[PDB]
Amino acid sequence: QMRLPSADVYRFAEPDSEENIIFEEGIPIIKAGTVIKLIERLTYHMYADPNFVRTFLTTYRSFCKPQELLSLIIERFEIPEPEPTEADRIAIENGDQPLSAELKRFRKEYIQPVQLRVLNVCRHWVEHHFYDFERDAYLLQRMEEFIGTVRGKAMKKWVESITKIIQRKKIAHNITFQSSPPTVEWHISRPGHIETFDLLTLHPIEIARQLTLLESDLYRAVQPSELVGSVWTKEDKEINSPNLLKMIRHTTNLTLWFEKCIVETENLEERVAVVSRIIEILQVFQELNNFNGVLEVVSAMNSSPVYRLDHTFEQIPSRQKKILEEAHELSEDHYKKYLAKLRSINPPCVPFFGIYLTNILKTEEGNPEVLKRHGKELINFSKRRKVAEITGEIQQYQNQPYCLRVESDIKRFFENLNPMGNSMEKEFTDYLFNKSLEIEPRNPKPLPRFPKKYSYPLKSPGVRPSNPR
Amino acid sequence: MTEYKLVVVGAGGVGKSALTIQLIQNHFVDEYDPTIEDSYRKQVVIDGETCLLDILDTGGQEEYSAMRDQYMRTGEGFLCVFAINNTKSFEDIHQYREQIKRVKDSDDVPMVLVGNKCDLAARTVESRQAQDLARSYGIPYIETSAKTRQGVEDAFYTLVREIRQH
Amino acid sequence: MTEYKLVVVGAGGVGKSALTIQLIQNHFVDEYDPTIEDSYRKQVVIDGETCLLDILDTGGQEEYSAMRDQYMRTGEGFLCVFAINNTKSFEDIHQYREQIKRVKDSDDVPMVLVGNKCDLAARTVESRQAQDLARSYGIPYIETSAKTRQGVEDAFYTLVREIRQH
Numbered sequence A: 001q002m003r004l005p006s007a008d009v010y011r012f013a014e015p016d017s018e019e020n021i022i023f024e025e026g027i028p029i030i031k032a033g034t035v036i037k038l039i040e041r042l043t044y045h046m047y048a049d050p051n052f053v054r055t056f057l058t059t060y061r062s063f064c065k066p067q068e069l070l071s072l073i074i075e076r077f078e079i080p081e082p083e084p085t086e087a088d089r090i091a092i093e094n095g096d097q098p099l100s101a102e103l104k105r106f107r108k109e110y111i112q113p114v115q116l117r118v119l120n121v122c123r124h125w126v127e128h129h130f131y132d133f134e135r136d137a138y139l140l141q142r143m144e145e146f147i148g149t150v151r152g153k154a155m156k157k158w159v160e161s162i163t164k165i166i167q168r169k170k171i172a173h174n175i176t177f178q179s180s181p182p183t184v185e186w187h188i189s190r191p192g193h194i195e196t197f198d199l200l201t202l203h204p205i206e207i208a209r210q211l212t213l214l215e216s217d218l219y220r221a222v223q224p225s226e227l228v229g230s231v232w233t234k235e236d237k238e239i240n241s242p243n244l245l246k247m248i249r250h251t252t253n254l255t256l257w258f259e260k261c262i263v264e265t266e267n268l269e270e271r272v273a274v275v276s277r278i279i280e281i282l283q284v285f286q287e288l289n290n291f292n293g294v295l296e297v298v299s300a301m302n303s304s305p306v307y308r309l310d311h312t313f314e315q316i317p318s319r320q321k322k323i324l325e326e327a328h329e330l331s332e333d334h335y336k337k338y339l340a341k342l343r344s345i346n347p348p349c350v351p352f353f354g355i356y357l358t359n360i361l362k363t364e365e366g367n368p369e370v371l372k373r374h375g376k377e378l379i380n381f382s383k384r385r386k387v388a389e390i391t392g393e394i395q396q397y398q399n400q401p402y403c404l405r406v407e408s409d410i411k412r413f414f415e416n417l418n419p420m421g422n423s424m425e426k427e428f429t430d431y432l433f434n435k436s437l438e439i440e441p442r443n444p445k446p447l448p449r450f451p452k453k454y455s456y457p458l459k460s461p462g463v464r465p466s467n468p469r
Numbered sequence B, C: 001m002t003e004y005k006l007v008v009v010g011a012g013g014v015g016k017s018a019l020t021i022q023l024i025q026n027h028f029v030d031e032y033d034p035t036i037e038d039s040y041r042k043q044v045v046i047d048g049e050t051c052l053l054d055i056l057d058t059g060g061q062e063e064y065s066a067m068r069d070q071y072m073r074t075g076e077g078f079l080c081v082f083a084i085n086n087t088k089s090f091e092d093i094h095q096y097r098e099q100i101k102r103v104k105d106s107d108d109v110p111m112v113l114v115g116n117k118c119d120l121a122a123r124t125v126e127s128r129q130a131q132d133l134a135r136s137y138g139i140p141y142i143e144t145s146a147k148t149r150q151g152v153e154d155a156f157y158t159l160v161r162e163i164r165q166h
């Protein structure tokens, strides 16, 4: 049995009680607790839980301010060591050197792990949640002063390290692959002739690849700070969730572009060619595990303007109808099949972010911030663990990069796509629907004929990659 | 038994998710997990008739505006929600109704107008303005306070009645 | 899918972190930041089966025997790493094996002996000496380079296969 400092000179030694900490019914899992108890466990001396550190650092701002968090971990770090024991006093009083058995044990089993864990929190804080520091300069000065006060040849390794990470973070990612990326594919449009780039002139395989690289980069850029507290749904969403919104807006624009390409091709035969090309792009998206790409296509095919084009879908080959149907099925029954498929593939992949947003929002609106026990308001940590489980799954899929070569011009083409032009949403959306009524009138109005608009061959080069280089 | 597919639509931040949660979840359990299977279905008894409610709430995904048509086509009845302290969300209702009519290709779709009280900020849409809008559309108006659970059952049950009487 | 808890151990500076980050992000970390304790997650298909890897990257030879034991309790498999250009790190291996055997109280805990930094020409530990040690423990020996990525997947995935057949 090891003695702890007096709860009178060190606040993190109060014993655990149903009034300051609650556990979830293999390390313990915290359901709720006071901020002091949460910090104690965040830096517990008995076991490790890097998972706790990420959860806490990702979600603490709703129950503790940055400045207060720093003050508390500094207090946690400053552990008073015990007084010599009776055996030591005897030795000291005889003029001998004390064995200090308990002092040495206390340092090895309590002080060292607690202080190392506090420093670990500081390191992860600065390395992965540096925005707290970018937004508050005094907080950073306090951190630097603290790390700079840490004495001892032992802690030296970590002090120097954290100091360097901090400096690196203030003044401002190579990739190695198992294999070599496949060769870029070209169809009608040739390299350098960006003016000719379009849905049917670029190779469908390369369209899916370049959009996958683009969508992957957008997905990988979303930080947890843009999600916690449901900030993307609030009035300052543009300020707090810029990367998320940019990712969603690209997806929306691409869906609208697919719809536009379809309804503006008035000639039935050419429209059938346009729809088939888009389904081939979906097929490559599936091969690449770009789920965001797959749903962009499904969303377009199920939009009001396109969904009603019976004469067009009637001419689509069965193998393609099947492909579209199976893609559509991923979202049915609340994405049941999509969730099963995502959990089974081999990354890299580009997940559909929508699911995550809804789950985070509901977790936050359906759980209380605090649980009350005997008049005490304990932080509801299980709520935070649930949100961090979601941000954690998002981060896991953000790690693996795609082994595909970027083609600058094609990438530029898609970055600048603007189907809506200068029109407002409602007007553009009404335009697409009116175009749909024009090209395929409601029954019993007869189907009119329209002149061709494409002067180049409409035959698709297919979706199987070629291999010459 | 009959299953009713209900879709909750409206501007972001009006409390659509809280309504769904309040209707579905167990209000007598410490923790709620929306990632759990079928946390969107609830068996209920309405006017002595037992049925299964399947609720699609896309709160949080409002920015994916091009996915709206697809999400809406899955429903038989719709809850059109606005926040009583947010006039813009009230003014958006008209377009949501028109879009629902378009994707269901019918001028007579089962729906209920729902005004939700999200917090204690000042109300900007009065009961009469909303009642008049609902009357002009020929649909019921229900006011809720998802936070206190008032009117939640009423909003969904009223919608189911609209579906049964279509 | 099955979850596997892997733990990477070995003397400080051998490449535990670089190996893990290369596996996780396909990125080579050139700077040296001593580790205290970090965790990573990786979904990957191995032998046609989808796995969820939990990788615990520990701090090495930092003379914190107390904490180390803490990491080994949870792990299902261990990657015991040394650098082929550092004899002392090779000599530290048996200490880790003994500790693991002790902590988990078992003579056949799944593990892989990893000789890292095989991209460097100044080798001081011969493959034969390491292979003999691996045979004495009844485990595979795999040489790797977190820099070039050589043998990295092989090391981690072989460990997964051992945990799976155990």
Ligand SMILES: Nc1nc2c(ncn2[C@@H]2O[C@H](COP(=O)(O)OP(=O)(O)OP(=O)(O)O)[C@@H](O)[C@H]2O)c(=O)[nH]1
Pocket: C010, C011, C012, C013, C014, C015, C016, C017, C018, C019, C029, C030, C031, C032, C033, C034, C035, C036, C058, C059, C060, C061, C116, C117, C118, C119, C120, C144, C145, C146, C147, C148
């Ligand atoms: N040339 C080469 N250098 C490597 C290789 N692996 C790691 N290094 C270098 O070795 C140094 C220490 O690598 P780390 O991965 O931090 O070592 P570690 O085992 O995690 O150290 P602790 O966390 O202190 O226990 C770094 O400067 C890396 O860049 C490798 O395969 N080849």
Ligand SMILES: [Mg+2]
Pocket: C016, C017, C018, C033, C034, C035, C058, C059
């Ligand atoms: Mg390390």
